[PDB]
Structure 1
Amino acid sequence: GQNMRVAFMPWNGYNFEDSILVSERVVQEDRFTTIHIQELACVSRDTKL
Structure 2
Amino acid sequence: KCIKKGQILADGAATVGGELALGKNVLVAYMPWEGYNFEDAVLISECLVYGDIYTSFHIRKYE
**What's the TM-score, normalizing by structure 2?**
0.59
Write 1 or 2 for the structure with the bigger share of helix.
Answer: 1
Structure 2: gaps (5+ residues): 1-22
Q: Which structure has the greater CA radius of gyration? A: 1
Shift of 1:5: 0.5
Q: Residue 52 of structure 2 is aligned with which of 21, 30, 35?
A: 30
Shift of 1:25: 0.7
RMSD of the alignment, in Å? 0.9
Count of paired positions: 41
Write 1 or 2 for the structure with the bigger share of strand.
Answer: 2
Letter in 2 for 1:8: Y
Are positions 1:7 and 2:29 aligned together? yes
Q: 4+ runs of 1 displaced by more than 2 Å?
A: none
More RCO (CA 8 Å, sep 6+): 1
